[PDB]
Enzyme design. Structure first.
Site, PDB file in Angstrom:
ATOM      1  N   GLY B 196       0.422  27.927-139.099  1.00 22.05           N
ATOM      2  CA  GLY B 196       1.181  28.023-137.854  1.00 22.05           C
ATOM      3  C   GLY B 196       1.593  26.665-137.316  1.00 22.05           C
ATOM      4  N   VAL B 200      -1.265  24.808-131.799  1.00 24.91           N
ATOM      5  CA  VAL B 200      -2.369  25.771-131.902  1.00 24.91           C
ATOM      6  C   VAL B 200      -3.439  25.285-132.899  1.00 24.91           C
ATOM      7  CG1 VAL B 200      -3.011  28.165-132.501  1.00 24.91           C
ATOM      8  CG2 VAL B 200      -0.911  27.713-131.189  1.00 24.91           C
ATOM      9  N   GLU B 218      -2.222  24.605-142.321  1.00 24.67           N
ATOM     10  CA  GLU B 218      -0.918  24.640-142.985  1.00 24.67           C
ATOM     11  C   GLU B 218       0.132  24.730-141.892  1.00 24.67           C
ATOM     12  OE1 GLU B 218      -0.161  24.584-146.338  1.00 24.67           O
ATOM     13  OE2 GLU B 218      -2.200  24.672-147.148  1.00 24.67           O
ATOM     14  N   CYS B 254       8.347  27.021-142.981  1.00 25.44           N
ATOM     15  CA  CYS B 254       7.707  25.713-142.783  1.00 25.44           C
ATOM     16  C   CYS B 254       8.189  24.625-143.742  1.00 25.44           C
ATOM     17  CB  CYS B 254       6.192  25.854-142.889  1.00 25.44           C
ATOM     18  SG  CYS B 254       5.464  26.608-141.420  1.00 25.44           S
TER      19      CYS B 254
END
Lengths: 485, 485
Positions: B196, B200, B218, B254
């Site tokens: 994410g 966070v 990741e 990503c």
């Protein structure tokens, strides 16, 4: 003075920033520069071995020869290892590829991370600050080191000497206690290595979380020694190895034998053998004077001139003395508060719920527990936190295999203690509450590098191009549906 | 319903405790059990491929074939890899030993960690929850998974199906948002994998710090695409690969091409080629309807029936539309708010200080910047956070080598984008703010295992015994001083 000057809080950002800028300016990028720095750090250790042993003696009351064996020689071997093998370690690795990627040109490259923070500890104050540093510099990083305030003579000497061998741009130094450690932890590093307690490790990792910084944590726990019933003929060597591991630094080692689990029938022979080993290693005169059976004119001066290390402080001394209440003092129990001296002490008839068998001892107290079957051993070991080391004395392959396969620890040594830490070729590290990550040699290089995969392709057609590109036609659906079932 | 029921806060400790007890009871220890679970998870994917594609379509508006290429096939290959190679991965490794330790019998064994927490993300909601899980189970752990609440149809289906293939004791499930994620993060795990945002990730790592739990993170960043002046003849393939990487999941990847740095003289040909690639992949009718140049009876229904994925929510849609203000819309800019549709949009004449070139775009906006020399490229890339991927299009070896050696990223692909993620044999992971740790195949097995060194010695004399044992005599000092000269 015998103490380093505390780094001002305003200078901490400047020190880190200079190391950051140095990294960005390729101050340790080229292998020639890295080898120069490693060779200079070898010179730091070798040219000042006498004074370092004296400083370590002032801090720990550790004998010069003990310091040579435990700190100086391992550091020398580490530098030589890193210089000798650097060209091998820096080269790209060609990974084993399967499927479509096997047609491309793939590599695993190693690159530096940036600035590494190394927070030292007090028990082996030269080894456990320089050994991580050597690895970080071998990997092309710059670094900041934070010497332990509980080894101030060593911290002072290292702080004085280090600038003469390595630039402050490549290795910055922050000196002080909680205030200064808290402050340096607010600065951004690309890796942090911390050696010490699980309590403070949590604080380090919380600080690292704020910058998403990877951490290597080298902690402790209660390293058990398992002794089975196949070592009767080797019991003198068994006891000598266990007792040596306990006597070094007065038990204050993260991989010291914390307690023993001995097969029921071997308890008496082991305890007797440990007693004999203790007498042999400490000598009759030392024990007699500590016991009060031989008078000397200055008892406290005699103990401060002895070859036996001191407990770190009064608080730790009192904690260790209270641990003797958790069982029968079978061997030893001799102590002197003024000189913080506690002789190696073997406890039997232990209450397993007592603090002595709940907490890491980190001192000269050695509880001895018994077992009858494997289940008894596993109940003792697996109900406690994963220790940094686990030791098994046995001549039986099946027994050793059973204990290894049913326990978890940072390492296992069969028929010895502690010596694996100096073994060139093993990664050194914990698991669970004994820590995360590992270093030494190649594993330092890996820990302080980023392993970066590289895939090189050409402009020709390949199997991925048959399906990846839209538009999503009925023909493509038929091709993909043929692969699926 | 299309949504999973939130796990009650009281049940979260019970779920984790059951997985903990299962691990302790060897529920996934034996290789036979691990292969059974992996084979059952293969059956989970293969038997329910149609319904998973439909659920993913409901969540993402991603076409079945795109989901097959990006999620289903990589998962199938991952299971086959892990089953095929498990026996190889579990075996002890014989390390290269140097010095005194070379005389002993040394091994590096691999052992399970315990319970692994996997926190999934929404953009590839099956791949990025199951791929880590497969690895954790291959390494003999039990696990708890936390599906993203922003892919609810997929979370519901997976929650329904998973218990039919793998026991809840071996794989627990926690469903919900911040409340439930915060609650599961209070429980003790032996490893946490999180995919994410960096924001966070900091919160996850802070929670992990409280139990000294290792983390694999990741994350993302702005993956640059460098295009030099040696690709004029390959410009169609260059543009097709870049545009494909951007079109998949409407840019919400990503490792999507975030922005382009193109050699000054190639800007026009690249932008034109990207425009042609976009038309080819999306089709004329889709673009005409989105532009408002072709009317249809139900415009919103037409776009919801299209082959082009949706932006995750209104907030992300508005953010991406505002990013178009940071440059000239050279190509595209077509959008529909009601259906959360934004066509791939190429921006030129960028203000580098604008949010579009400061934040991870994670959407269909592609800024195009120019360079004249290497220094210009490095100033753009090295002033920003280390991205998960870096892409270089070039036929010049020296140029490629220069860019690789002077940048840091989670990976480098030459002459393509995205495809390295499916490469069997490469570790997949970030560095710095793109993350820490790596997984896939062997690297999943390694990440979810503890590498445990074992040293086996005999009871005979060896070189260490000449110096290690007290008492510290004048003879010993002479022996050690001979080594230090």
């Amino acid at each position: 003075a015998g103490v380093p000057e505390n780094t001002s809080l305003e200078n901490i950002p400047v020190i880190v920033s200079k190391c950051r800028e140095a990294f960005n300016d390729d101050a340790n990028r080229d292998l020639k520069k890295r080898k120069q720095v490693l060779r200079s750090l070898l010179n730091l250790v070798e040219e000042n071995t006498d004074e370092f042993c004296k400083a370590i003696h002032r801090d720990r009351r550790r004998h010069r020869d003990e310091t040579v064996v435990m700190e100086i020689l391992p550091l020398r071997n580490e530098v030589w290892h890193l210089i000798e093998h650097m060209d091998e370690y820096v080269k790209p690795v060609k990974p084993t590829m399967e499927g479509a990627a096997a047609l491309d040109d793939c590599e695993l490259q190693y690159e530096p991370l940036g600035v590494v923070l190394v927070i030292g500890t007090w028990n082996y104050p030269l080894l456990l600050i320089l050994q991580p540093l050597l690895g970080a510099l071998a990997a092309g990083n710059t670094a900041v080191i934070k010497p332990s305030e509980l080894a101030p003579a060593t911290a002072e000497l290292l702080t004085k000497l280090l600038p003469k061998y390595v630039s402050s741009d490549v290795v910055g130094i922050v000196n002080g206690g909680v205030s200064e450690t808290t402050a340096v932890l607010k600065e951004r590093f690309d890796h942090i290595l911390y050696t010490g307690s699980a309590r403070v490790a949590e604080i380090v990792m919380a600080a690292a979380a704020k910058h998403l910084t990877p951490v290597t944590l080298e902690l402790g726990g209660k390293s058990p020694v398992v002794v089975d019933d196949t070592c009767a003929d080797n019991m003198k060597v068994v006891a000598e190895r266990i007792m040596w591991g306990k006597i070094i630094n007065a038990g204050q080692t993260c991989i010291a034998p914390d307690y023993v689990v001995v097969e029921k029938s071997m308890e008496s022979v082991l305890v007797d053998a440990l007693a004999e080993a203790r007498k042999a290693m400490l000598g009759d005169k030392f024990l007699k004077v500590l016991k009060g059976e031989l008078l000397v004119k200055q008892k406290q001066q005699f103990l401060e001139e002895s070859d036996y290390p001191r407990i770190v402080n009064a608080s730790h001394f009192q904690r260790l003395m209270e641990f003797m209440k958790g069982g029968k003092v079978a061997v030893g129990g001799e102590a002197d508060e003024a000189t913080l001296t506690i002789a190696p002490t073997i406890l039997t008839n232990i209450d397993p719920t007592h603090p002595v068998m709940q907490e890491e001892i980190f001192g000269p107290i050695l509880p001895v527990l018994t077992y009858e079957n494997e289940k008894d051993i596993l109940k003792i070991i697996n109900s406690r936190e994963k220790p940094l080391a686990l030791y098994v004395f046995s001549n039986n392959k099946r027994f050793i295999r059973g204990v290894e396969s049913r326990t978890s620890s940072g390492a296992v040594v069969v028929n010895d203690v502690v010596v694996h830490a100096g073994a060139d070729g093993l990664p050194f590290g914990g698991v669970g509450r004994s820590g995360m990550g590992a270093y030494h040699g190649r594993y330092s290089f890996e820990t302080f590098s980023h392993r970066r995969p590289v895939m090189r392709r050409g402009f020709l057609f390949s199997s991925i191009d048959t399906v990846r590109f839209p538009p999503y036609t009925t023909a493509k659906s038929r091709v993909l549906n043929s692969l699926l079932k």
